[PDB]
UniProtKB/Swiss-Prot annotation:
InterPro entries: Glyco_hydro_22 (IPR001916), Glyco_hydro_22_CS (IPR019799), Glyco_hydro_22_lys (IPR000974), Lysozyme-like_dom_sf (IPR023346)
CDD domains: LYZ_C (cd16897)
Role noted for this protein: Lysozymes have primarily a bacteriolytic function; those in tissues and body fluids are associated with the monocyte-macrophage system and enhance the activity of immunoagents.
Subunit structure: Monomer.
Family stated for the protein in its record: Belongs to the glycosyl hydrolase 22 family.
Disulfide topology: C6-C127, C30-C115, C64-C80, C76-C94
Descriptive protein name: Lysozyme C
UniProt miscellaneous comment: Lysozyme C is capable of both hydrolysis and transglycosylation; it also shows a slight esterase activity. It acts rapidly on both peptide-substituted and unsubstituted peptidoglycan, and slowly on chitin oligosaccharides.
Organism of this sequence: Colinus virginianus (Northern bobwhite)
Length: 129
């Protein structure tokens, strides 16, 4: 499903991403735009045989099990297919796990390049929230 900007922001808000760990809602929406263009079915195969899934392009090498990635790690304890749903529950629970573990949102390179240090309030402009 291709979410609309405000629709995804409202869904992420309902799931408690608003200022989770000090990362405002706009940071999350900005990240999703540049990672998947708000497309929940987005998948990106990598040379290492890993695939990035969903709105936040969560990698199968360490975060979810897709049955075809070397290493067999699944830190979020979910099948990668759960990240392709129009229901963002699993994506949010997993992203909260990622952001708590390493260099915050720096885990998303798209976020680092186009979001970090910029006025992200603009991402939730005109949204009822």
């Amino acid at each position: 499903k291709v979410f609309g900007r405000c629709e995804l922001a409202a869904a992420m808000k309902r799931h408690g991403l608003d200022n989770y760990r000090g990362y405002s809602l706009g940071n999350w929406v900005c990240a999703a735009k540049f990672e998947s263009n708000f497309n929940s079915q987005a998948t990106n195969r990598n040379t290492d045989g890993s695939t990035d899934y969903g709105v936040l392009q969560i990698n199968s090498r360490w975060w979810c099990n897709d049955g075809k990635t070397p290493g067999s790690r699944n830190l979020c304890n979910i099948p990668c297919s759960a990240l392709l749903s129009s229901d963002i529950t699993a994506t949010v629970n997993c992203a909260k796990k990622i952001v708590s573990d390493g260099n915050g949102m720096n885990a998303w390179v798209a976020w680092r390049n186009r979001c970090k240090g910029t006025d992200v309030q603009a991402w939730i402009r005109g949204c009822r929230l």
